[model samples]
Target chain A: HHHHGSKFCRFGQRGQEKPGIIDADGNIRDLSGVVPELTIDALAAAKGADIALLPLVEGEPRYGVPVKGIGKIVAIGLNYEDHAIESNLPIPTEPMMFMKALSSLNGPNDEVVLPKNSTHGDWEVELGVVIGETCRFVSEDEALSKVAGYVLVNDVSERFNQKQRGTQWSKGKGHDTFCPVGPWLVTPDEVGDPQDLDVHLDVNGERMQTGNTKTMIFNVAQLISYVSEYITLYPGDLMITGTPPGVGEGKKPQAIYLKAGDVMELGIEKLGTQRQQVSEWRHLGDEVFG
Target chain B: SKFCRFGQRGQEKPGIIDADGNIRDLSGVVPELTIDALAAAKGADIALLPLVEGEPRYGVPVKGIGKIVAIGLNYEDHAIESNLPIPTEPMMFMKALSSLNGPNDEVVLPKNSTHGDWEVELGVVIGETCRFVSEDEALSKVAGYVLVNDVSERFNQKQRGTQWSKGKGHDTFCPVGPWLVTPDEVGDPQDLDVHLDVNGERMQTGNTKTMIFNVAQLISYVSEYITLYPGDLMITGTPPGVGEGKKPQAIYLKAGDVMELGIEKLGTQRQQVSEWRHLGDEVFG
Candidate 1:
């Protein structure tokens, strides 16, 4: 009922999500029964368990972000030359780093809420490099070994908070649900030639962003090594490479932005696809704030 | 013994400073002065720590803090001096946990820094895990309060790009407390007077009454967005009078400069500025 190659996923009903693996035929096998703790490391170690022994579930379980217990999410800015040009910003000689609050991560396919005051909500399809091991002062050659796997991340942005409010991009980029991270995590062995993978995103039904990792100014190995020099990269940490051109800010003839009722679908090769419906912030009722 | 952490930097041992100012070993009681311990016992019970014979080095009061969330421009005067409008809401930013340092630790100025400055703020330590909570239920989640000297570099913050985190997240940028005073012990956080003196000269003097956003509202506001975990640190923003606000020209800290700051009823912390170096070097060297 399943294929031989491996693909890992985290899924379950809303509050009880657990680690599971997607087989060659797209069937999911829950690992929580066999593994006492379902952390990424524990899931990595249980990768070889017999899939036939696990139970299969019905219906689409809400997929939680593949990795949990992440130390931090570090992001790069203007690493793509064309994107830098589109945004009218200068390319940085060094990797420009920024932090995304851990709280910002959301499950793939979760509704993307436009912040209470956002008018320039936008989408960025990016390649997310997940760290498998802790490393510091590592060389480029040693960097790739530190990568455990890769995931698809939509680095959602709020242009107003990211730019108009102040100089710090964190404010615009840090609203809750700003990061939608997975469908499943494909280990490095399964994702050969990461630099050559196709990355794409679409709004509604129109294709907007189409680029390859090869166009990235700083490749995976270089970013891992460069970022590690400044901050230690621990297992489960996510380093989201910069986005390519075609961001809303780069739209010609008066930049366009996201509004309620918009839908975004994006993906990276070998990773998986993610679709998010956009809407205004829904009140969680008076009890939450009462 | 008063609760504290002591010994060398990375290998610091959980300890307590006695009423007589002598260091006591808490390793026998609890493994480390971690966030879990903070939650296990809001009030630390002293079982008598052996008087350590030497002047022991101190580290940040609590260990294994999950995240350090900070408020920006909460004070009206500081916002005015910086030529920014008083925000209707609290503006939040993240300071890497790696940036956290001991209260009396030496603050490291990153390489090629120009506008090195200081922000003395009232640090709130969270004890309970709560999300979607109301302001009425916010303070109950707080474990205690501490003093934080929010060290910043202007160039990296404003010049590098639009994000303030670049300048805010350098290693050793956050120098936290000498102790964590329980809320029951630190009555009326809003009424406390705070002051900072640089090398014996008064630079900033203000009271928490000036904060545009109170601790309760801030905690509640942030919790609505993210879960506030045990041992999470939410440093209420600083008051006016940073070196960057000086008239005519901005004055910044340099190597050898010493800063002493404190919140009434909480405690005092003193730090000396030093230049950045390759990792693994002695902090005070």
Candidate 2:
């Protein structure tokens, strides 16, 4: 009856934390200010809380892509080497992993569309994580105890469907609202130094990407013990963790893409911010596929 | 766009049928609903695809992918009518979305699915969240189009394996529905049309303008690698005719049988058969 005992408070510990489950008004609060607990009464209040804490909301607060009993989402291209030198490409030693459809997750301020043969639709700003349990061959010293904190991704890329043909970035990252993370979920003791935080991105107001997770070449418990030796990581999956290197198609010979009234702004630092805006998916009602 | 499973009090509960199909029973309207409660009440259309007369219980669309993907040779006449070998790329595979069933229901026959085949494709439905798109934004992120079957077990998909997601993901092997047409009432998804039938006998037909990779270049080319979400689905490759292309071609499926499919104006599905999960696993075992 000890199903992975300790039942709460494991995000790089060190605190007087409380929320591992108590409210009927017991209110010892802090599941990182909660949300992402996705049903079953938010995972029985995130496994009956002793530490869940989230709530960092700043800027585009909306949010999406936290995962809810997801079966397979996997992703990790060029595992971040100064984000392949900010899109110049070539850091791949091994670990290019891919697979997205957790419904193309979106939030952190949803609204970034621009589809219809998009000209560039770019942006990256990442650092996500969240697994909380169900692995397979784990061990990076148990992969940050099967992780369960740190949100603030955006990995919204599509540089012409991943460098003009030869496909597989899941066609520029699967679509819907294109992977945006949350406005909350902090905890590794208030998300201390996930490789040292920072990671920025802003389009319609301008600022482009910034990056920081202190140049991770592969951190966050060695990418959950290197993606658990080939698929199998449940309990609310999600991972993002790779992006940094001012993208817009790594601008130089003129890049930047996203149009239709454009807005797209993503973030990180202490895990917050998400915003979207850019429509154009017209197929509109009653037209059932011909 | 074509991974169905909806329900109401009359069975088949997992919802979203609208366009005159009217079901709307998301676990009794709300109380739960996701993808942000159908993207916040799908702009409050109310009434879903309800109205099934009886016996309909099964629902897929939960978050999609029970399995089913197949493209294997984008018809050059279904690759010379079946003699095979016309694939210069587009031959990917998979088909399980949990063997998706409904539309009129019934294409069972498995306990050793001989060569039971039939294909009519043109599914594609990733409503948004796409990665690395292009081919002109991949037809604005298509959110409609249906009429699939892709049903196959074909000698365990070519003699027990060459890897075809277990002869195209079993269970029901995708039947799809009679609703969800959206994409602006069907205006040239590469021209439309497609066809199919079994017990009533027709075989398979084709269209969606012959697709080599349309639907906005296979949803922006399968999303640069793979991340296309929102009830995630994509068939659009079946053209020509199938039963494995012919020449002593193939045709399998037993128990009660009956199947039908259509596209053109987008609407038509009539499956019917029954019994056979190894004789109904002993009537619910």
Candidate 3:
């Protein structure tokens, strides 16, 4: 259904609509909302009882975000092999695919929490490609067609954790609130060319990571095609194609990581802009989770 | 590091003191594989199931387990001994799981893995999903405990930057196992005695009793802001005697040295040292 109730619905507004399970036969019914006292039995009992005519609402935290267990956070090492050489990392003969934990996935617009002990938490403005539909063994062209939409993703990382920690970049990149995405979900229909967009990460009003998407060596379509060969692309899964060369880790002398009092703002052409404040994670020793 | 208390409204299960010297797995009673579920059951019965009764394989048993969350140099004495600045706060990181390997598995020598160092630590398994959990309630949620050899590749690790994962999470970098010891047998995880032996030589030693942030408080503190999932794991900081704490900082693992480590009441394990290879290589080979 388009929405439970919207003025544009041709099926007419439905009542007291809720996302629920159909016992045996498939029937639309109102189950329950996020209530403190919701019980399984109460949910199971909501069969055939939806008295349509209840008000349909908007902006209800109503639908869960589209995600498929965060398959692989594939990133590019150096689309332009020269960038790889600059970082002293071997340019991959092929795309250097890496991964971050699913725990790092957060809804776009969510707060980015900077771990207290982190001194090198930095930002990488990246173009996030969400696999709209599932496709495996997809060709390069098929991979492009599988793209559901585009969203701006800020690949917040801790340079200290990455460059200092032994090898895996995932550790430095996979903290809570490390990845925040989504003010608007723009379908591919709206996005003309992912490679043609300008992407940049600004810290405290200073241009930090500045490079247009056109500069990306692999580009959007190639990244999708390359990633599909290694893992299946499921609907709602994401890939953060690499960042530009201005990362703090690449800064000369003693580079500085984003600390408290710093604000990170990043944007892609149509994806819109995002502003985040860096704060240390404070452990509250009180309050048992209810 | 997780102390799972039993006997809550009468739910108990079987468990054991593993070779790695941690109390875990009340396998004598319930067949469920998670320590958290057992901790929740509490105080039903103690079916003493001995090690070797089951095929042993160290694994992340729960879903959504986070990366290796660490507290660098939590021990005051260790910090003093290492000549490192005392941390104003607990230094933390999510070490990659790629480096995690089962207990008793051989510690490998990656051709580039120099300074193959060891930090014998207590690996804490979280029993419940918690956020902002109080210190008082923290102890009750621990599922059990295990011994972890936080093997380090010093050159790549220390020279990298400040991130511990680089050095800490090399393949077969984390040698965890013999088995999990349940809380009932553990009594108090924070109070356990732990030690490490390299090639039959006692290398490092410490105790949960000496931890700066006791198990309960540590978990509770972690719950703040971080949404821990059911199978998530937290490795308590190591005590003194790390290579960094030694004279001239002896480091590096060879291809033949045997690594043995354990926690009190938990069992011990050995890992043969070797080289590194991708998981795919091994599978397809």
Candidate 4:
């Protein structure tokens, strides 16, 4: 457990490495003393009213992967018709679940490292649903109870590694910092309509994707219920609903890809925005060379 | 923590299975048998508890496994059997951690599953955090090795989609254990004999030397894509004789089938196949 500064958007000292809550006004409220960990199980046990009243820290603060100790990053594919059409693939009959390595998750504003030798790096602004309760074999009506909140996710991918390097997309999607999540985990109450919300992504300040959750083939409830049939959705597990169209892969003439100095800004209504600058991968020297 | 879980199916208790073939209660030795305990084991100084009478039920060697990243088509013969070419790189995929079961646990063939199959793979247990590691340095991060039976469902794997995870990650699909053999004890992982049997009939028999990508290379290659954490299981690909590879036609598993597989000094695992029972069936019946 390490300290993540300010609960919301302003930078503060790396206070005690603990989980805190951000209220409706974007004020920080410490929850370390109440909840042992920021896990779904812990959050579920704490009284919501009490959590909202903890001493508020003045000013905005930075964010990390809103919740730590995340178990897995389960991503769906071709769940959006426009995205499938753009990628030249048929819409999936079921949620095509693939796992992204936990190591790939980084803060919303964290730098996105372009993998070495990669030329087709891409961006996917997605609606991330954070699980609050362990759910399996649940009906769609009961699915929303399992959701802790929603956050914006940039499901960064490399098309070459995703498509060419075998069939599994995780190979390209599991690179470090490939999944930039958060800014804040807005409660389901605050998110209002999971569907019908505006979702958009921008590259270098120009609109790239302009679809809404209304176009999603699989809504949050259906996805949760369908995904639960296969794997148990744990409290800290993350299910990043598929992205909309207008990814670099869908660009006309020739596909455009990301490189150093490029910046991506994406957001879902009420979930807040995420901004990241692309950079080249560097060997951090932590790895022991065999 | 050279550990084993004791007790009935749902109430497993952590304990150490000593070198003398004895079960010592580990409830006091450390906290629950988890990835954190494994990482903090060096300072935990394990001591043996009084031996229990009669045999105790065993669970998967490691508890709280974070993820199971497996390789496909790592053996040339296996590739050939599947009518696929030798992969230029390790074909990486994942099995849901829920798929894990004890070595001797019953493998429940999922409801509607007809193409149940078996694969014997050398399971590498990661000890430390590894990211972008090199081939030469990869083996050092290995906590040890275990025998893994990568049970598969071919129809769900192929017919569902291109992703193998759909077929690979069913409950009780991965039966691992018998022992967690240390690197020093196992020795020369690149040259070990891996074998599997179905009902006393030999199915797969291959040597690690036949692996297209050795342990070091596979570990290093995988690290480049995903960070390997403590308690992570890397089940290397299997050899040719999986039921799907049988020449005349593919022979699939049926309920009541038995499987026994092993990898050199890593020891053996035996599992009995059973049909899956749906909770809904019980509730609505």
| Top-TM-score structure, candidate number | 4
lDDT of 1 by residue, A174-235 (tens): 66678998988887778887898998999998998988888888899999987765555777
lDDT of 4 by residue, A163-220 (tens): 9989988888888789988877776776777898898989999999988898788889
Measured against the true chain A, the candidates' chain A TM-scores are 0.92, 0.30, 0.71, 0.87
Model 1's alpha-carbon lDDT is 0.79
Off-target runs (Cα >4 Å) in candidate 4 are A1-16, A45-47, A285-290, B1-3, B9-16, B26-28, B32-49, B279-285
Candidate that would win on lDDT: 1
Give each model's whole-structure lDDT.
Answer: 0.79, 0.57, 0.59, 0.78
**Candidate 3 local lDDT, residue A81:** 40
**Best model per DockQ:** 4
- What DockQ class does candidate 3 belong to? incorrect
How do the residues B151-251 of candidate 4 rate in per-residue lDDT, one tens digit apiece?
99998788877788878877678888866666877889988999999998999999888899999999999988877888889999998898987879888
Q: Write the per-residue lDDT of candidate 1 for residues B1-285, one digit (tens) a residue.
A: 135788887788887666676777777678888767754333456545567768877778887777788888898667776788878767777887667888888777877576899999999988887565689999998878888988888887777666676677666788887887778778888989999989989999899988889999899887754556778899998888889888888889888899999999777989988876655423320
Note the DockQ of each predicted structure. Answer: 0.30, 0.04, 0.09, 0.44
Q: Rank the candidates by TM-score, best first.
A: 4, 1, 3, 2
iRMS per model in Å: 3.9, 12.8, 7.8, 2.8
| Ten contiguous residues minimizing lDDT sum, candidate 4 chain A | A1-10
Error of 2 at A222 (Å): 41
Output the lDDT of residue A62, model 1.
85
